[PDB]
Design a protein around this ligand. Structure first.
Ligand SMILES: [Zn+2]
Ligand SMILES: [Zn+2]
Lengths: 143, 62, 56, 117, 117, 144, 144, 185
C-alpha cells in the first residue's frame, strides 16, 4: 500500500521482520518472500527522500541476505545478477549486498554458487571499490 | 550578552508584546507638555534676560 | 570575540572594561564579579578573556 | 580535558597571565602590571571544546520543579528519593535545537534531583 | 558521495572535536601521558587538536592528508605528528620549529577557519 | 506569645499572613480573645477586625470567633459598631457577612438593638445612606 | 443567454445541506483524525525516549518535523478523500467544483472534513511564547 | 557579589534593586498582596522567570493586560455566591471591582502570561481524565473575548475563513445605521 514507508519512523519496519521470521520458520514460502522482496525493491517511492529510498532498499536487501542465509541462495544471486547488468539499480546497493554476503559466508562453496556469484564481484564497478580478497583467492584456487 | 552567546538564554523577540508598550493619550500629551513647558520656560528666560539688562523688574504676566 | 559598549554621546565604540574602570572599579576581581556571578563556570571566563586582553 | 578559568593576582588582584621562563622549564602565571608570578598547577593553558557537548544536567536548576507550565509524569520516579511525580522538559540551549531529549526534575522540594532517561 | 566530499568545502571547523594548547617542554614526558615514544618520533608550546570519528569518516579523510595540508600551508615552521587511528582517539599534535602563545593562538584560528582540507 | 498589654498589635498581622504556623495562629487568636474579654475598646475594637482569607481552612477560627464574641458588654457593643461602620469603608472581605453572622447567631436581644441603633445613627448622619443600609439588611437576610 | 435562461428553469443554489456529510463519513473522519493524533503522539514519544533515529542529511528536529508533517498531510489527504467520496451528484459544492466555475476539492475537504495544518513561513505555528504557542498548552508541546 | 549566583535577582520597572533567597514564597506573598487590593495595585505585573533566577515587577504605563479568573487546586475561585451577588448588580452595589477585590479575577499582562498555565474553559479542570495538566493557574472568562469591536459583530466567526473575518472587520466600519443618537444637532 502506498504511503506506508513514509509513515514508518523506525529504521527497519516490523513487517519486514515478520517476513524474516516467515523465512526462518519455513522454506516452502521462500519464493513468495523473494517475490514480495523484488516487488518492493523494484518499486519507486517518489514520496521518500533519496537517502530514505536508499536505506529502504538496503533494508529490503538485508531481508534478501537473510533469505540467502536461510538456504534460498541461487534465485537471490540470480536476481542480483539481473539487477547488475540489465537493470539500472544502484551499484552501491550491489556492493552492499556483496559486503553483507561475504561477511556471513565461509568456505567451502559449491560450483553453482561460485559460478553465479563470481561475475558480480568482477564487474569493474564492484571489485575496485570493495574480505573479498580471500573469496577471490579461494575461487581462483578451487574453481 | 554572554548567556545569549553561550546559548543558555534564547534571543529576545522584538514582536513579543511583553517587550512593547502602548503610548496612550496620557504619555503622548505628557511628552508634548514637557516640550512646551520647556519652551515656555525658555521665553521666560528670554523676557527676564531682556528686562534684567536695564536693571528693571519685570511682570510675570507679561 | 571582544565585548564592546556603544555609549550615548560618544561617536566611536568603547570596550566594556574601559567603561567598568571608568565607573571606579580598577581591578579584575571587581569587574568580573560584577559580570560573572559564578566562578565555577569557566566558559564565561573564556569569553571575557579578549575584553580584558584588549583593555590591558 | 576541561575548561580553564581565570586565576587572579594576589596584590593588585588582576588576572594572571601565562609566562615562560628560560631557567626552570616550568610554566609561570605572571601578572604583568605588578610583576607577581605564580607556579602553574595545570599545563592546560587554553582548551576549546568546539563540539561543546555540554552537560545540560549541570545547566538545569532544581527550581523548575515548581513551574506550573511544565508537564508532569507519575511514570518516572526519582532515583534519589523515590518520589513518583517529576516534571520533564527539553533542553533550551542553542546547541540543543537538534535533539528532543527529555530532562526530568523531581517534584519533591527536598531533593530536586535531575536526571535523563 | 566521494565527488560530493571532493566538492563540499571542509576545514578543521567541521572535522575536529576539540582543540587544546598545553605546555610540554619535555616531549619525552608528555603532560597527557599518551605514547611519549610516539612523540619521540623546536618550541615547548604544542597545539593538540582532537578529531571525531563521524566527521572524519563522512569525508573519508585520513590524518596523512591533513598533516600534509598543514605542512604545505605553513611551511617548515610547523611540525605535525599523528597516531592512534585504531585507538579510538583521533589526535594530532602541532609544535613550532624555530611570545609563542599568541602565535599558537593565531595559527589555531587560521587552521580552524582559513585553510581547506 | 502574649495577649494585649500594648496599644497597637503586631502579631495579629503576622499570624494572619502566616496562616495557610496555622496551629499557633489559633492559640494567638484565643489569647487575644481572652485578653480582650475583660476589656479598653478605643483601639482594641478596630484593630481586632483582622482581614481573613481562608473559609474552609479557617472554619475552626470562624467558630472560635463566636466564642470570642461571647465577651459581651463593651467588647461586643464596640465590635458590632465597628462591624457596622466597616460597611462604609468598602469591606471587601468575609468579615462583612460571616463575622456579622456570629453576632446574628447570638442575637439574644443584642444584635437587633445594636443594629437598630446603628441604623438610627446612619439615618442621623448625612444622606444617600439609606440604600447602603437596605443593601446591608438584604445581604444579612440572604446570607443568614 | 441560452444557458442563463435555462438556469431560470433548472436553478443553482448552495446551502447547509451541501456542506454536511452522513454519519458514516463523519465517523471515518474522526477515526482518521484520532489515528493521526495517536501516530503523532507515538512519534513524539519516540523522539522523547531518544529512540528516533535521524534521517541522513538533517538533525533530529528536522526529521521529527518531517515525520509529523507527513502524518498530518496523510491525515488531511485521507480525510479529504473520505469527504469527496461522500458527495452526491446533487451536491452543489461538487457541482461548482467539477464545472470549474468556483472552488476546489481542497475547499470541499476543508468545509466538510478538516481544515488542516496552519503554517507560518512554511513551518508550523512557532513558539511565540516561551516554548509554547499559546498559554493554554504545556511547555515543549509538539502535538498537532 | 558571591551571593548573586544562588539568589534571585529582583527587577522593579527594569531596575535591579537587589536579590532574594526565597523567590517562591516571595512571589506567593506578592500575589497575595495583589489579589487583596493592597499596596500593590491590580495593574502591577509580577513575573518570575524560574529557569533563570529573576523576578521582574512592572509598574509603568503602556502594558496591555486582560482579566483572567484565578484557578487554585484545579478549581475556580469564582463560586456561585459571586454570580448571585453580580445578578443583582444594581441592588447591592456589588460590582466588577468587588470581584477583583475578592481575589477572584486578576489582570494578567503579556509578560506574566508567559508564566501562566491557563485553562480555556472550566471543562479543562477535570481530574477524572488525564486532563493534560493539573497545575492550571488561570482560566479564560470566555474564549470569544479575544475579538475586537468589529470582529464581535461577526456571527459564527469560527465557521468562516479568517481573511473573510478580516474583511468583515474592515467593512463593519463602512456600514450604515444610526451612528449616534444626537445626529440631528
Ligand atoms: Zn597583579
Ligand atoms: Zn526526588
Amino acid at each position: 500500500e502506498p504511503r506506508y514507508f513514509q509513515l514508518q519512523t523506525d529504521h527497519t519496519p516490523v513487517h519486514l521482520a515478520l517476513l524474516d521470521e516467515i523465512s526462518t520458520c519455513h522454506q516452502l514460502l521462500h519464493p513468495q518472500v523473494l517475490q514480495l522482496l523484488v516487488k518492493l525493491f523494484e518499486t519507486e517511492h517518489s514520496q521518500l527522500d533519496v537517502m530514505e529510498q536508499l536505506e529502504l532498499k538496503k533494508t529490503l536487501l538485508d531481508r534478501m541476505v537473510h533469505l540467502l542465509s536461510r538456504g534460498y541462495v541461487l534465485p537471490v544471486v540470480s536476481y542480483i545478477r539481473k539487477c547488475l547488468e540489465k537493470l539500472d539499480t544502484d551499484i552501491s546497493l550491489i556492493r552492499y549486498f556483496v559486503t553483507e554476503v561475504l561477511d556471513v559466508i565461509a568456505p567451502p562453496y559449491t560450483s553453482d554458487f561460485v559460478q553465479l556469484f563470481l561475475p558480480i564481484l568482477e564487474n569493474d564497478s564492484i571489485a575496485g571499490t570493495i574480505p573479498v580478497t580471500e573469496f577471490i583467492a579461494h575461487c581462483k584456487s578451487n574453481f | 550578552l554572554l548567556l545569549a552567546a553561550l546559548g543558555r538564554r534564547e534571543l529576545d523577540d522584538r514582536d513579543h508584546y511583553g517587550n512593547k508598550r502602548l503610548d496612550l493619550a496620557g504619555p503622548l500629551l505628557a511628552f508634548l507638555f514637557r516640550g512646551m513647558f520647556k519652551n515656555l520656560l525658555k521665553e521666560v528666560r528670554i523676557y527676564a534676560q531682556k528686562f534684567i539688562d536695564r536693571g528693571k523688574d519685570f511682570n510675570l504676566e507679561l | 570575540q571582544r565585548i564592546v559598549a556603544t555609549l550615548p554621546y560618544i561617536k566611536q565604540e568603547v570596550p566594556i572594561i574601559i567603561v567598568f574602570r571608568a565607573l571606579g572599579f580598577v581591578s579584575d576581581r571587581d569587574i568580573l564579579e560584577h559580570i560573572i556571578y559564578d566562578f565555577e563556570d569557566p566558559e564565561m571566563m573564556e569569553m571575557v578573556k579578549p575584553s580584558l586582553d584588549e583593555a590591558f | 580535558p576541561g575548561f580553564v578559568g581565570i586565576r587572579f593576582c594576589q596584590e593588585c588582584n588582576n588576572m594572571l597571565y601565562p609566562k615562560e621562563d628560560k631557567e626552570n622549564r616550568i610554566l609561570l602565571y605572571a601578572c604583568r602590571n605588578c610583576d607577581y608570578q605564580q607556579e602553574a598547577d595545570n599545563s592546560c593553558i587554553y582548551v576549546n571544546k568546539i563540539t561543546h557537548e555540554v552537560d545540560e544536567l549541570t545547566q538545569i536548576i532544581a527550581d523548575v520543579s515548581q513551574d506550573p507550565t511544565l508537564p508532569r509524569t507519575e511514570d518516572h520516579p526519582c532515583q534519589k528519593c523515590g518520589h513518583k511525580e517529576a516534571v520533564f522538559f527539553q533542553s533550551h540551549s542553542a546547541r540543543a535545537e537538534d535533539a528532543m531529549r527529555l530532562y526530568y526534575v523531581c517534584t519533591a522540594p527536598h531533593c530536586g534531583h535531575r536526571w535523563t532517561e | 558521495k566521494d565527488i560530493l566530499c571532493r566538492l563540499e568545502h571542509t576545514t578543521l571547523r567541521k572535522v575536529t572535536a576539540n582543540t587544546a594548547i598545553y605546555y610540554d617542554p619535555n616531549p619525552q614526558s608528555t603532560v597527557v601521558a599518551e605514547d611519549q615514544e610516539w612523540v619521540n618520533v623546536i618550541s615547548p608550546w604544542l597545539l593538540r587538536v582532537e578529531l571525531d570519528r563521524k566527521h572524519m569518516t563522512d569525508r573519508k579523510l585520513t590524518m596523512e592528508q591533513i598533516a600534509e595540508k598543514i605542512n604545505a600551508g605553513f611551511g617548515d615552521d610547523l611540525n605535525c605528528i599523528f597516531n592512534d587511528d585504531n585507538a579510538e582517539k583521533l589526535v594530532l599534535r602541532i609544535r613550532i620549529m624555530n611570545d609563542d602563545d599568541v602565535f599558537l593562538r593565531c595559527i589555531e584560528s587560521n587552521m580552524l577557519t582559513d585553510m581547506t582540507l | 506569645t502574649c495577649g494585649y498589654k500594648e496599644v497597637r498589635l503586631l502579631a495579629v498581622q503576622k499570624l494572619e499572613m502566616w496562616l495557610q504556623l496555622t496551629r499557633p495562629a489559633q492559640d494567638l487568636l484565643m489569647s487575644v480573645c481572652m485578653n480582650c474579654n475583660t476589656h479598653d475598646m478605643d483601639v482594641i475594637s478596630h484593630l481586632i477586625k483582622i482581614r481573613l482569607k481562608p473559609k474552609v481552612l479557617l472554619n475552626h477560627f470562624m467558630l472560635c470567633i463566636r466564642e470570642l464574641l461571647s465577651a459581651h458588654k463593651d467588647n461586643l457593643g464596640t465590635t458590632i459598631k465597628l462591624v457596622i461602620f466597616n460597611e462604609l469603608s468598602s469591606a471587601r472581605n468575609p468579615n462583612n457577612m460571616q463575622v456579622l453572622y456570629t453576632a446574628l447567631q447570638h442575637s439574644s436581644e443584642l444584635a437587633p438593638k445594636f443594629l437598630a441603633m446603628v441604623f438610627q445613627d446612619l439615618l442621623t448622619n448625612k444622606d444617600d445612606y439609606l440604600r447602603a443600609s437596605r443593601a446591608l439588611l438584604r445581604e444579612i437576610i440572604k446570607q443568614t | 443567454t441560452v444557458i442563463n435562461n435555462w438556469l431560470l428553469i433548472e436553478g443553482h443554489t448552495i446551502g447547509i445541506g451541501d456542506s454536511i456529510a452522513d454519519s458514516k463519513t463523519y465517523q471515518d473522519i474522526q477515526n482518521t483524525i484520532k489515528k493521526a493524533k495517536q501516530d503523532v503522539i507515538e512519534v513524539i514519544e519516540k523522539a522523547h525516549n531518544n529512540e528516533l533515529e535521524p534521517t541522513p542529511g538533517n538533525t533530529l528536529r528536522q526529521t521529527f518535523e518531517n515525520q509529523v508533517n507527513r502524518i498530518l498531510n496523510d491525515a488531511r489527504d485521507k480525510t479529504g478523500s473520505s469527504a469527496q467520496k461522500s458527495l452526491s451528484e446533487y451536491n452543489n459544492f461538487k457541482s461548482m467544483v467539477v464545472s470549474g466555475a468556483k472552488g476546489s476539492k481542497i475547499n470541499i475537504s476543508q468545509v466538510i472534513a478538516v481544515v488542516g495544518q496552519q503554517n507560518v513561513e512554511g513551518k508550523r505555528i512557532p513558539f511565540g511564547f516561551k516554548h509554547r504557542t499559546l498559554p493554554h498548552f504545556i511547555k515543549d508541546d509538539y502535538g498537532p | 557579589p558571591a551571593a548573586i549566583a544562588d539568589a534571585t535577582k529582583i527587577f522593579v520597572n527594569g531596575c535591579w534593586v537587589g536579590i532574594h533567597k526565597d523567590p517562591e514564597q516571595l512571589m506567593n506573598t506578592l500575589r497575595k498582596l495583589r489579589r487583596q487590593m493592597d499596596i500593590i495595585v491590580s495593574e502591577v505585573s509580577m513575573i518570575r522567570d524560574i529557569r533563570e533566577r529573576e523576578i521582574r515587577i512592572y509598574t509603568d504605563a503602556g502594558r496591555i493586560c486582560r482579566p483572567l479568573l484565578i484557578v487554585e487546586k484545579q478549581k475556580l475561585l469564582l463560586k456561585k455566591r459571586h454570580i448571585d451577588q453580580l445578578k443583582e448588580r444594581e441592588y447591592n452595589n456589588y460590582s466588577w471591582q468587588d470581584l477583583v477585590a475578592s481575589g477572584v479575577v486578576e489582570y494578567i499582562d503579556t509578560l506574566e502570561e508567559e508564566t501562566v498555565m491557563l485553562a480555556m474553559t472550566p471543562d479543562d479542570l477535570q481530574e477524572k481524565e488525564v486532563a493534560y495538566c493539573s497545575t492550571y493557574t488561570h482560566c479564560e472568562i470566555h474564549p470569544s473575548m479575544i475579538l475586537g469591536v468589529c470582529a464581535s459583530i461577526i456571527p459564527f466567526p469560527d465557521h468562516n475563513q479568517s481573511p473573510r473575518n478580516t474583511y468583515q472587520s474592515a467593512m463593519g466600519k463602512q456600514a450604515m445605521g444610526v451612528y449616534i443618537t444626537n445626529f440631528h444637532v
